[PDB]
């Protein structure tokens, strides 16, 4: 199987980019022209998944094969939580990274995949520091904040990004006898809590996902310490997907220049009509999945 | 960056005036002719925001650019709570004051902007004396009562205005050992609670907002000690926006002359059909935002 | 009045020493010969105060005058909480430092003395970081952990010493927006929480008090980061006060040399028969005083 | 410092023996003649500690020096929980093993010693599998069940011995995905829970302590899987310490021969008058210490 370094060397190439979720070959072609670094083939954007309801599963193998033949950038895919056979079918198709999505219906209500047995690197969700460290223990090669997929509200993504980054800053200065106590409270391996405290960052690349809907929200996450952004319903549910796409990609490249950001936001168009994240009942919140 | 005095010298020029919220260049032209002191460009008046629902964001940069070119009085804008990048884009556009509105959807559920790092002065909401003093600590150059935006009921604005002004009157006569105890109960800096107690007023200009719907309500707030009034849905959701506008502006200039106030109120027209503030559930109350 | 620097320059001379509580001139003479740095005149050691009960007050002015004439090292005294007139009488007698003791019966159930109006430096108790910072705000020139006076159990002193020092280590690495949140939770001035976080120690000298009963416990507190130790009932309620005194003084000077510590502990004698700190009801715990 | 193997090679020499707690040189001489493998010097047997109350501490250094000069078998000692300076003084005296006893008054209510920094091997208590694995993580070179010291009731020791050994038997057959779930429930390192499951025993020597009072109880613990027995108040609080001593030592050597055990128990004498373990309130139970 692929060494952990090489899986933690496919996740580092994605730094400072944008990943756009697409459903058809034409949408995949659009994203590549805008300058994206990867695409995420799925049957329907997270906004539609809330609307349609029912049971969501892995995309049809026919679609993921067509997108791959259409773009040159790496292609990712989604699999249900704990469905180690779905992740086997995607890997055989040639995807470069499999995303254990909480958007799709969980298949195993207790366990996640055993990601160390596979070769393709994975990406997993995380709400706090405890969840980030457990996932890396299982072999996750990247982490992305859960947020609230399909709502267009960046309130939840910022909350989870300050929880992960807020805790990692407190670990500085603590003594060994205390870092052992923290590992108990957050229920994380003690080997990682010491590796994190020495580095002051998650030992794997960390992205932002859920609620990114405008060029301003994209550059906000990069100013909180993210290495990139996952943009889904925000672009292709907007007024003009083509214009919004180039704006978001350019926003991440100039997240620290206020003068330029004003230029980008002009003429982009109206964003997706979201849903207030505080309006969603807890039982309906996708973020609650991924124990 | 701009010195606190100059930011606390742009907020003082607005004393004894009216600020009217507008959405289109024509509405901006209307307000200026009525004699207003400033306009607040936004995508939709707070009355529509309740009706439309969804996620509300910063206005389109194209609109704020058009209003600025249309009026000579200063132009303000709104930004979401905690979205320090949106406040960066507005400042680059040339607005003279950015309003951290609780009407829009909060972007950060824990923190507000760090307003001391910017040059354009800010304005922030407040329900009591504790909230007013914390905001000024962060660099707010003006305070306005939250009220209940979009309801047309002046019950909530009066309540919050007697909470802020009622507390500042109790601080007179107290001894140092006691002013320290108050700062604990209201959770405010002790340096400000002593500056307030010596001045018997908020050290920054204070306006009234939310529920002002008639020339009588406008002059009521000025008789409770306000320095001005923020009028939003009240004017342009009324029967005749043009006539209501001149009446409200004239009401604030004669708030202490009963004979004249009768003359102003004649022929103005029917006010906006409001909503009883006591009918709104707490979870739906915009005033609860702005912790 | 004495400048805060000079009061924070009388507290620094006491670093790396032992302060022994004495009741009679002969006990005061004993402590000086053992090499102590100061004595604390009081009517009865904290062990007797629990036994006798009743109301405890400031020592008789006749006693404090006799001790001062007997020793050359500085003489301290105790005063009740909030009794600003008792602290006035001691200062006139010539004591060099007044100790706002929680052992004595509180006189004011809401407020402490206003220690900035006096010239003699003060010392005050503290259970956590919040209490340490409030006391320094009022003008305290030294801090000592409350512990559980008169029990001979070093369990409580260690607990409070890891609470104060444990919190100061977490403050390293935090950002300004977060140090403001901490100051709210611990209810401390924001100016101090930033001074502490930059220094990684309390800005004033910190001692250990309560439960020190053997040469081992004395060197334990110095190994947790204390600058000294307050030893009360431990020495003069032991089998041989003369031998225990020289041992404790020598323990603090060799707290980091295991070979020597064994030599000191040989032939010292039996320590005071203490009381298990977990056996004391909360209403009877002296540490609960000093809100 | 001593390698973990050598500390886990001083604990293995004690297999299949008896360790007798002694207070005076004569008692130490008695135990050696009976054929014991080690002695545990302390100020008073656990039976007296309950009766005397107060605060219990490390023995006088004079006593531990006298016992060592009297016997040829290794000499152990006790230290309070979390008192890393007391364990330093004993090591300098020449003891071969330091016992972090829960019988003595805890000195640190949150943490135990950091036993990896020392050279002398340690022994620590344990009520279940979770506690046994955490202690070994810190560097414990032996484990002994807590039981209920000083009661003479073998009900509690058997309970804890079936908890530790009962859990280790369930771990057989489980899959990796499940051994990770167990490590969460028992809050133990995942590296040890896999080492235990492969060996089907604690990776360090395990003894029995608390409630052993007769030659029958001694051989009962050895039939439940113990490697030895710690006998304290049982022998020297009995009718005839000399006869009981040889009986208990001989019981452990013939724990599996019913015919011989009858011969040993004849003429031994009356055992210590114990206290029913179910009569002791939880707050008074020594076993509750050692979190």
Numbering used by the authors:
A (entry chain B), B (entry chain A), C (entry chain J), D (entry chain I): 11 to 301
What are the paper's exact sentences on this?
Similar classes were noted between negative stain and cryo-EM 2D averaging, and by employing a single-particle analysis approach with the cryoSPARC suite, we reconstructed a cryo-EM map to 3.38 Å with D6 symmetry. We found that the native PdxS complex exists as a homo-dodecamer of PdxS subunits, and the previously proposed supracomplex containing both the synthase (PdxS) and glutaminase (PdxT) was not observed in cellular lysate. Our structure shows that the native PdxS monomer fashions a single 8α/8β TIM-barrel domain, surrounded by seven additional helices to mediate solvent and interface contacts. Monomer tips also interdigitate at the hexamer-hexamer interface, creating altogether three distinct types of lateral contacts that give rise to the dodecamer, here described as AB, AA, and BB. A network of six inter-subunit hydrogen bonds anneal the facets of interface AB together, while two such interactions comprise AA, and another four comprise BB (while each has 1 and 2 unique bonds, respectively, these are doubled due to the inherent twofold symmetry of the “self” interfaces). The first 10 residues lack clear density for modeling, as was similarly observed with the Arabidopsis thaliana Pdx1.2/1.3 pseudoenzyme structures, indicating that this region is relatively flexible when unbound to its glutaminase, PdxT. The M. acetivorans αN helix displays several solvent-exposed hydrophobic residues (I16, G19, F20, M23), with regions of dense negative and positive charge above and below, respectively, which is highly suggestive of a putative binding interface for the glutaminase. In our maps, no instances of PdxT binding were observed, even after extensive 3D classification and examination under a low-density threshold. Based on comparison with previous crystal structures where PdxS was co-crystallized with R5P and various intermediate states, the density is most likely to belong to either bound R5P or an R5P Schiff-base intermediate.
